[PDB]
Design a protein around this ligand. Sequence first.
Ligand SMILES: [Ca+2]
Ligand SMILES: [Ca+2]
Lengths: 726, 726
Amino acid sequence: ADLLVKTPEAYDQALKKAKPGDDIILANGTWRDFEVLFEAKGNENKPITLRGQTPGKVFLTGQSNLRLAGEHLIVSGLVFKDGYTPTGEVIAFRRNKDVLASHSRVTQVVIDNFSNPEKFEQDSWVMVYGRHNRFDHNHLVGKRNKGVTMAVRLTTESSQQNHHRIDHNYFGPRPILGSNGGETLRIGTSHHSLTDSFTLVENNYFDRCNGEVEIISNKSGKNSIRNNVFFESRGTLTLRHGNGNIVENNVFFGNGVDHTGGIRVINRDQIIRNNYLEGLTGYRFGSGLTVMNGVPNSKINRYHQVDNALIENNTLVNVEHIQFAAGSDKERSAAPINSNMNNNLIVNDQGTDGITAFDDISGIKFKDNLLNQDAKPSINKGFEQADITMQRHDNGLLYPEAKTQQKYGVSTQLEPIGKDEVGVSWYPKVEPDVAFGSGKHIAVSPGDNTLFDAIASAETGDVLVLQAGEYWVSKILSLDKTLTIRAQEKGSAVIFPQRSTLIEINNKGNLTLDGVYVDATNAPDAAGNTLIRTTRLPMQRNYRLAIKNSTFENLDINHSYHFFDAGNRSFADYIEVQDSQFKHITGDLFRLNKETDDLGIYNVEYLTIENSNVSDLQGAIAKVYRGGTDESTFGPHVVMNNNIFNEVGKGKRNKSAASLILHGTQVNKMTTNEFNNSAPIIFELTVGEPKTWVTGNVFEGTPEPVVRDLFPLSGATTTISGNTVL
Amino acid sequence: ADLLVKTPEAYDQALKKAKPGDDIILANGTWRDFEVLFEAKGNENKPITLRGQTPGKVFLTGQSNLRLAGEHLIVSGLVFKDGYTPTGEVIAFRRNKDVLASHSRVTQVVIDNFSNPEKFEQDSWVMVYGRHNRFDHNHLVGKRNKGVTMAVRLTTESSQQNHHRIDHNYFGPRPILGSNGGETLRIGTSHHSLTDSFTLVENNYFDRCNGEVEIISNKSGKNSIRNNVFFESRGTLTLRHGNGNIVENNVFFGNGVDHTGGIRVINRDQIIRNNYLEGLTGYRFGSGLTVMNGVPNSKINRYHQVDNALIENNTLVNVEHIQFAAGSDKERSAAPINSNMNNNLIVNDQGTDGITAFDDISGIKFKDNLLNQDAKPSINKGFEQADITMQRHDNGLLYPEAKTQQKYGVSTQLEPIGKDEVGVSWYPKVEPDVAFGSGKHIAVSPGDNTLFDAIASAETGDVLVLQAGEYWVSKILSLDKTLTIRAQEKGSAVIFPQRSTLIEINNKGNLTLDGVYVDATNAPDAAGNTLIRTTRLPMQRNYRLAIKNSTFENLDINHSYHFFDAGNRSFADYIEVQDSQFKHITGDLFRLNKETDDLGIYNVEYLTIENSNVSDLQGAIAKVYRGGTDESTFGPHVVMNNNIFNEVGKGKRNKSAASLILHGTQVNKMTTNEFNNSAPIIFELTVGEPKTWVTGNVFEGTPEPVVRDLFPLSGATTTISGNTVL
Ligand SMILES: [Ca+2]
Ligand SMILES: [Ca+2]
C-alpha cells in the first residue's frame, strides 16, 4: 500500500505502520534539514520502499542525509542538493555500527554538489555496510571536499563477504582535491584489506573523476571490477591493498587529456584481463599500466610486493607509459615475482612501446605480446612486431584489421556502457565549469564604483570591457562568478585601488584580467595589503586565475604589499600569467605556501608565468609548498619561461631569501629567463621522483639555483644546465 | 517644523525641504542598510536636527552609517547595532575629503557592537573633521576589530585648530585587539602631529577600554585632556606625538586589575597636573606614570625626546610602576631634559616608591614630593618621607589626613564624573561578557547526540550536567554561546568523538569543561584531527576556554591529532588548564602560532597550565608566536606551574623539536614542573623587554631550556636558575 507523507513527523508515523510491500512516498517539494532514518524490515518477496512522489521533484536540502537499517529495503527517486550531511555520510547502509542494512537497494538517487562548505572537512557521500546490498542507477556529481565519494566498509565480519553490487551508476565529474583522499570508489580499508569482500563493481561510467591518482581504490580481497568505462578521468583503477581481485572488461578513454591513467597493480594474485586502454597520458603511479615495487615485510598500509599477477589480453593504444617496478627505491625494494604478461596488444604511434622498467623485471614472464612495427620494443623476449593497422568497430573500440592479430588484446564482443545508459533519465548530465567569455560583453565606463556595480550585475561567463579612463575602487571587488575584465584598449584603463584589497575571489569566482593597468599608489598606508586574493573564509570550491597583457605598479606604499595571497586551504586549478609587467612591490608576487602542516595539501595545480616582466619586487615571484610524503597527486606544476626578473627577492622581510622557492613541486620547468641582480631559485625536492628542468637561463648578479634534497637521493630527475652565470 | 519620516526616500524628501530650525525625525523601528548622508545648513540660533522619534527605539542595522556635512547640524537619539559600516567609518563629520561639517553636534547616539565580521578588516566608528564640532553624551561599546574607536582628523588646515569638544561620553568596554590599532580615542596622526588641534576631551568615562596600550593616543598639539575617569582600563593615556598638551584633573581607578596604566609622557612642553592615579599595575609603556626616552633627531612617527615636561600635584596610590627614561635602548637614547616633577604625592604599600630609572634622569628636577615612610625611596633630593594615613573623601579619592600634607598631590576639590552621569539614561550599561555558570543547570543523559541536542537548545551561561555513561558524538559540537560542560561525577561521563573535530568554538562561544573524560579512540582514522578548535572562518570576537579536572586520552588513531587548534586571526582572552590529564596524543597540545606575518598579531592573551599531567605527547605542549617589533600590547603570557610532563615533544613531525616553543611572548613563568624524557623549552625573545622566570623545575632526561635572542641585547630579563638537570 502507498503511504504519502508531507512532513518528517508524518514520515515517522508512516514508517511505524509500514508493512512488507508498502511504499512510503515523500511528497514532491523541498525537504530541508531532513535526516532520514529508514529502519524497517521488508520481505524477500515484499520489500519496504521509500521513494519520491515524482523522481526529480523531491529534494533533500540543507543538513539532510539518509540511513538504511534492517533488511529488504529500497530507496529511490530522491535528489540531494543545496546542502551537506551533518554526519559522516550522506547515504549510509546502517543506522550505526551495531545496526546495519542488508539485502537493501538504493537506486535512482542523485547527489549533486552536496559538498561540505570546507574542502578539508571530510565526509563521504555513500557508505555501504552489511551484506547483499545494491547501489545502482544513481547519479553522483561534484564532490569538492576530502573524503571518498563512495566506499564499502569492512569493519566487522557482518560487513565482510558482502557480495555487494555497484552497477550502472553515473560517477560524474569530481574536481581535483589537492591532496590525498579524493577517491571516487574505495572498497575496504588497509586495516581490513586481508578480508574477502566479494564486491561486484560493474557497468558504471566514471566521467572526469579527477579527485586524485586513485579513481577506484581497491583495498580488500576477491572483488570483481568489470565492464566499467573511465572517460577522461585524471587517475587510475588502483589495486591498492588486498589480494585475488579480477579487473576485467574495463574501458579507459583518455582522449589524450593530461594525467589520465591507468590500471595499477600491487599485491598478490591479481588478474588484469580483457581491458581496453586508449589515449592515456599519465606516468609513474598514474601510468596507463603500472606494476609497482613493494616493501619487504610491508606494513599493512604501505606496499605489498607484486606476486603472481596475470596480465593478459589487454589492448593498449597510444598509452604513453607502461611502467614496471614503478616506485622502486630504498624502501620499495621488492620487485615483482611469479607474474605473467601474455597475449596483450600495444599499438603506439609515438615511436616507442612506452615501456620503462625501474628495477629487475625478470619476475614477470612475457609471452605472445604483439607490438606494431614502428614502436621500438623496450623488451626483446615475449614481444613480436608486426604491421598493424587499427580500425574502430561499432562498439567504439579499436581492433587490428587482421583477424589473426585479434587473438592479441581485447575481445571483439566487448560492449562499453554508454554515458546515457547509466544514471537516471530524469536528471541531466551537465558541464561542471563555466567557460571564460561564454557569456555576453558588457561595456563599462569610468570612474567611481562603476566597476563594483558592473561586476555585481554581470552574469557568470560575462566579459566586462572597460573604456579608457580611470577606475577608482573604494569597495572590495568580490567575485563569486566567472568573469573576464578586459580593457577596450590595452593600458588605457587604469584601476586605482583605495582599499587593502582590490579583488577578492569567493566560491564560484574565477577571474581573467586582460590588458588592464593597476596603479596601487592610493591603497591604504598599511602593511600587509594584498592586491588580489581569495576570500579568507575556507573555500568550498577550486578557482581559476588568468592574467594577460596587464601591468601592475606601485604596490609599495608600505611593506608586505603582496600581489596575490592565497587563503588557507584554497586551491587554484591554475594560475596563468602571460605577457604582463609588475613593478615596485614590497610583498611577494604569489603566496602559494599556506599548507605548512605537511598533510600533502597544496594551493595550485598549474602555476604558469611566461613572457612577463617583474622589477623591484622585495619578495618572491612565487612561494609554493606541498609538504609531507604523499604520493597521491600530480601537482604543483611550476612552469616559467621567457621572463625577465630584475631586482627580485632581496627584501629583508623575505625569509626564504629566494626569488622563487619551490617545496614539493612535482614538475618544474624554468626556461629562457633572465634573473638579474636577484635572490636565487631554491628547490626543496620531496618524495615522488619530481622532474626539474632549468635550462637556457641567464643568472647575472644572481646566485646559481640552490637544490636542497630532502630525501637524498630518493630521488628526483633534476636537470640544471645550459645556463649563463654572470 | 517636525518632518516625521518612515523610509529613506521620505528622509531624502524631508532633507531637501528642511529649513533652519527644523527636525527630521526617523520613526521608531529598524532601519536596515541605511547610509545616512545628513547634509544641510542651519544657523547658529536655529540648527537643523536629525533625531530618532523615541531615543532607544530607532535602530540603524546592517550596512548602515552616518555622514554629517555643512554647518549647525544636530544628530541625536539613534542606536547603531546588528551591523557594521560598509565604508571606513560608522559616523563621519564629513561627506568626503572636500565637504566637511562644522559647528555640528552628535549627541545621545549609541553604537553597540557594530563591528566588522573580521577582526583585521580595519574601520573606525567616529571620525571628526572640520571645526567647532561636539561629540557628547554618546555610548560606544564593543568594537572588536582593528582601528581606533574614535579619532579626530587633521588632514587639512580646515580640520586643524578645531576646538572640537568631546565630553560626557560613555566609552564602554573594548576587548583586547591582539595587535596595535586598538585605541579608543586618537587625536591626529603622526603626519600632522606638529599642527595645533586645540581639541577638548573632558568629563568622559572610559570603562574597561582594553583595546591596546593606548586608551587615548594624543598625536597633535595644544590639546586638553581633562576631568576624565579611567576605570579598570587595560592601557594608558599616551601623549604619543605632538607638543604643548595639558593632561589635567583625570582619575584612574585600576583596582589592581592586570596591566592598568597610566599617563605616558613623550615629546615636548607637556603639562601633567592634578591627576589622581590609584591601583595601577602596569609597567614599561603601560606604567602608572611613564616618561619615555626618545630618539635623537627622530622620524616624525617614532619617539621625540621629552623636553620641558611639567608633572605636578598628582596623587599616586599603590601605583606599582613609575618609570623614567622608559624604553631606553640603542635607538631611544635621548633622556628627558628641561623637566620638573613637583608637589606629587606617592603612597605605596608594597615597600617601594615604585620608581625605576632606565637611564640618566638628571634632566628631571624634583622638588617637594612626598612619599610614605614605609616605602623605600629611589630618589633622595626632591623627595621627603613621612607618616601618612590616607582617608577617602566623599569624591571617592584618598587624601592625607594631616592638613600640612594636603599641599602634596591632587586638589581636594576634584569631582570625578560618575559612570551614570555619562552617556544616555535610556540605554543600559551592561556587562560585556556572559559569565560561566550564570544561567541554569541542565541534566543531560547518554548517549547518541544527546550532547549535540543539549548544546543546541541551551542558553548562554548555562551548565550542562552529564549523567554517568557514554556520550557518542557523531556531529561536530558547535559552540556559539557561553557554556559549561560538567560531569555529574568526575570520571563517569565518557565522551567518544566520532568526527575529526569534537568541539568547534564559533563567535560568542566560550567554553568550560569540568570533570569530563574524553576518549578519542573512535575518531576518524585520518591525520590532522583536532579535538577542540575555533572555527576556521575568521572570527569577529575573542573567546574564553577553561579546562578543569578533566581527562583527555587516545588522540592517537593517526598522526597529527591535535588537542586544540587556533584558527587564523583568532584570539583567546584566556586559555586556562587546571588539574587535568592528557595522554597519548600524536599532535600538538595547543597550537597558538598562526600569525606568522610578523605584524604583531597573536592568538592568546593568557595561556595557563597548572597542576596538570601530560604524558605521551608527540608534539609540543604549546607553540605560541607573536612576530615583529610591535610594542603596543601586553601578551602573550605563558604560565605553567606544578605540572608533570612525561615523554613530550620528541615526535618526528614536531619541527620545533621543543616541548614548548615561545616566540615574542612577553611574560613567561615556568615553575615547579617535572619535564621527564622530553624535548626542551625554547624561547625566541623579541622586542619589548620580556620577562622570563624558569625556576624550581626538574629536567630529567630533558635538555635544559634554550634561549635564542632575536635582539641581542636590548632588554629581556631572563631568570633561569634553581632547576635540577639529570
Ligand atoms: Ca588515495
Ligand atoms: Ca597604538
